[PDB]
PDB file of C-alpha atoms in Angstrom:
ATOM      1  CA  UNK A   2      55.348  88.842 204.953  1.00  0.00           C
ATOM      2  CA  UNK A   3      57.070  86.683 202.271  1.00  0.00           C
ATOM      3  CA  UNK A   4      59.002  87.796 199.127  1.00  0.00           C
ATOM      4  CA  UNK A   5      57.250  86.083 196.140  1.00  0.00           C
ATOM      5  CA  UNK A   6      58.623  85.383 192.578  1.00  0.00           C
ATOM      6  CA  UNK A   7      56.242  88.121 191.353  1.00  0.00           C
ATOM      7  CA  UNK A   8      57.828  90.617 193.830  1.00  0.00           C
ATOM      8  CA  UNK A   9      61.380  89.970 192.440  1.00  0.00           C
ATOM      9  CA  UNK A  10      60.124  91.160 189.026  1.00  0.00           C
ATOM     10  CA  UNK A  11      62.742  90.956 186.194  1.00  0.00           C
ATOM     11  CA  UNK A  12      65.640  90.240 188.551  1.00  0.00           C
ATOM     12  CA  UNK A  13      64.544  86.740 187.378  1.00  0.00           C
ATOM     13  CA  UNK A  14      64.723  86.645 183.535  1.00  0.00           C
ATOM     14  CA  UNK A  15      63.764  83.964 180.959  1.00  0.00           C
ATOM     15  CA  UNK A  16      66.213  82.097 178.721  1.00  0.00           C
ATOM     16  CA  UNK A  17      65.790  81.247 174.996  1.00  0.00           C
ATOM     17  CA  UNK A  18      66.700  78.013 173.084  1.00  0.00           C
ATOM     18  CA  UNK A  19      66.512  77.270 169.328  1.00  0.00           C
ATOM     19  CA  UNK A  20      66.702  73.441 169.854  1.00  0.00           C
ATOM     20  CA  UNK A  21      63.079  72.880 168.635  1.00  0.00           C
ATOM     21  CA  UNK A  22      63.197  75.497 165.798  1.00  0.00           C
ATOM     22  CA  UNK A  23      64.908  73.764 162.860  1.00  0.00           C
ATOM     23  CA  UNK A  24      62.613  71.942 160.385  1.00  0.00           C
ATOM     24  CA  UNK A  25      63.596  69.659 157.469  1.00  0.00           C
ATOM     25  CA  UNK A  26      62.061  70.374 154.018  1.00  0.00           C
ATOM     26  CA  UNK A  27      60.708  68.100 151.275  1.00  0.00           C
ATOM     27  CA  UNK A  28      60.989  68.659 147.487  1.00  0.00           C
ATOM     28  CA  UNK A  29      58.506  67.801 144.718  1.00  0.00           C
ATOM     29  CA  UNK A  30      57.888  64.064 144.179  1.00  0.00           C
ATOM     30  CA  UNK A  31      57.236  64.455 140.445  1.00  0.00           C
ATOM     31  CA  UNK A  32      60.603  66.206 139.866  1.00  0.00           C
ATOM     32  CA  UNK A  33      62.399  63.043 141.151  1.00  0.00           C
ATOM     33  CA  UNK A  34      59.973  60.351 139.903  1.00  0.00           C
ATOM     34  CA  UNK A  35      59.965  61.462 136.224  1.00  0.00           C
ATOM     35  CA  UNK A  36      62.122  63.067 133.508  1.00  0.00           C
ATOM     36  CA  UNK A  37      62.711  66.828 133.847  1.00  0.00           C
ATOM     37  CA  UNK A  38      62.432  68.122 130.240  1.00  0.00           C
ATOM     38  CA  UNK A  39      64.225  71.468 129.784  1.00  0.00           C
ATOM     39  CA  UNK A  40      61.930  73.969 127.950  1.00  0.00           C
ATOM     40  CA  UNK A  41      62.999  77.134 126.021  1.00  0.00           C
ATOM     41  CA  UNK A  42      59.454  78.432 125.120  1.00  0.00           C
ATOM     42  CA  UNK A  43      55.907  78.234 126.622  1.00  0.00           C
ATOM     43  CA  UNK A  44      54.800  75.297 124.386  1.00  0.00           C
ATOM     44  CA  UNK A  45      56.377  72.073 123.066  1.00  0.00           C
ATOM     45  CA  UNK A  46      54.467  69.782 120.661  1.00  0.00           C
ATOM     46  CA  UNK A  47      55.052  66.009 120.915  1.00  0.00           C
ATOM     47  CA  UNK A  48      53.622  63.693 118.191  1.00  0.00           C
ATOM     48  CA  UNK A  49      52.285  60.265 119.285  1.00  0.00           C
ATOM     49  CA  UNK A  50      50.868  57.285 117.367  1.00  0.00           C
ATOM     50  CA  UNK A  51      47.041  57.336 117.678  1.00  0.00           C
ATOM     51  CA  UNK A  52      45.512  54.563 115.444  1.00  0.00           C
TER      52      UNK A  52
ATOM     53  CA  UNK B   2      40.323  55.003 103.983  1.00  0.00           C
ATOM     54  CA  UNK B   3      43.508  57.134 103.651  1.00  0.00           C
ATOM     55  CA  UNK B   4      46.015  59.157 105.742  1.00  0.00           C
ATOM     56  CA  UNK B   5      45.029  62.874 105.602  1.00  0.00           C
ATOM     57  CA  UNK B   6      47.468  65.763 106.234  1.00  0.00           C
ATOM     58  CA  UNK B   7      45.599  66.461 109.546  1.00  0.00           C
ATOM     59  CA  UNK B   8      46.045  62.801 110.671  1.00  0.00           C
ATOM     60  CA  UNK B   9      49.834  63.001 110.316  1.00  0.00           C
ATOM     61  CA  UNK B  10      49.441  65.696 113.059  1.00  0.00           C
ATOM     62  CA  UNK B  11      52.588  67.482 114.385  1.00  0.00           C
ATOM     63  CA  UNK B  12      54.972  65.180 112.448  1.00  0.00           C
ATOM     64  CA  UNK B  13      54.477  67.986 109.898  1.00  0.00           C
ATOM     65  CA  UNK B  14      56.129  70.806 111.872  1.00  0.00           C
ATOM     66  CA  UNK B  15      55.947  74.519 110.922  1.00  0.00           C
ATOM     67  CA  UNK B  16      59.031  76.600 110.154  1.00  0.00           C
ATOM     68  CA  UNK B  17      60.361  80.071 111.031  1.00  0.00           C
ATOM     69  CA  UNK B  18      62.282  82.867 109.234  1.00  0.00           C
ATOM     70  CA  UNK B  19      63.282  86.336 110.485  1.00  0.00           C
ATOM     71  CA  UNK B  20      64.180  87.472 106.891  1.00  0.00           C
ATOM     72  CA  UNK B  21      61.268  90.010 106.862  1.00  0.00           C
ATOM     73  CA  UNK B  22      61.707  91.104 110.534  1.00  0.00           C
ATOM     74  CA  UNK B  23      64.494  93.705 110.381  1.00  0.00           C
ATOM     75  CA  UNK B  24      63.458  97.378 110.021  1.00  0.00           C
ATOM     76  CA  UNK B  25      65.802 100.405 109.953  1.00  0.00           C
ATOM     77  CA  UNK B  26      65.598 103.161 112.633  1.00  0.00           C
ATOM     78  CA  UNK B  27      65.743 106.815 111.492  1.00  0.00           C
ATOM     79  CA  UNK B  28      67.217 109.685 113.561  1.00  0.00           C
ATOM     80  CA  UNK B  29      65.960 113.264 113.980  1.00  0.00           C
ATOM     81  CA  UNK B  30      66.507 115.549 110.978  1.00  0.00           C
ATOM     82  CA  UNK B  31      66.830 118.708 113.105  1.00  0.00           C
ATOM     83  CA  UNK B  32      69.271 117.082 115.575  1.00  0.00           C
ATOM     84  CA  UNK B  33      71.632 116.450 112.564  1.00  0.00           C
ATOM     85  CA  UNK B  34      70.893 119.459 110.277  1.00  0.00           C
ATOM     86  CA  UNK B  35      71.651 122.024 113.057  1.00  0.00           C
ATOM     87  CA  UNK B  36      74.141 122.571 115.908  1.00  0.00           C
ATOM     88  CA  UNK B  37      73.513 120.622 119.127  1.00  0.00           C
ATOM     89  CA  UNK B  38      74.109 122.978 122.114  1.00  0.00           C
ATOM     90  CA  UNK B  39      74.850 121.638 125.630  1.00  0.00           C
ATOM     91  CA  UNK B  40      72.767 122.959 128.580  1.00  0.00           C
ATOM     92  CA  UNK B  41      73.477 122.773 132.363  1.00  0.00           C
ATOM     93  CA  UNK B  42      70.021 124.106 133.458  1.00  0.00           C
ATOM     94  CA  UNK B  43      66.426 124.418 132.105  1.00  0.00           C
ATOM     95  CA  UNK B  44      66.881 127.965 130.652  1.00  0.00           C
ATOM     96  CA  UNK B  45      69.587 129.845 128.678  1.00  0.00           C
ATOM     97  CA  UNK B  46      69.456 133.519 127.593  1.00  0.00           C
ATOM     98  CA  UNK B  47      70.951 134.558 124.230  1.00  0.00           C
ATOM     99  CA  UNK B  48      71.186 138.342 123.532  1.00  0.00           C
ATOM    100  CA  UNK B  49      70.807 139.370 119.842  1.00  0.00           C
ATOM    101  CA  UNK B  50      71.024 142.718 118.015  1.00  0.00           C
ATOM    102  CA  UNK B  51      67.447 143.927 117.344  1.00  0.00           C
ATOM    103  CA  UNK B  52      67.547 147.371 115.578  1.00  0.00           C
TER     104      UNK B  52
END
């Protein structure tokens, strides 16, 4: 007639560790690759040479 | 061939002017012709001579 781990219920109690939890985060590529134009209205018109 | 006003495109911008925008706001006539009475509750009783 043994005493099992199951028979010692919650006198044995689990620990917790956050060591795997943290995750690094990556921004937009296009915000660093190219010029960020500040806008003050929904639309801006840019003329370009066409012929 | 010639350069049309459409083919200059957005090099011809379009302008703005708020000179027609402003309109006056008008108060209540009765709220300035007559006495404004304070109230602390929905109903007030005023006794008057009747006969």
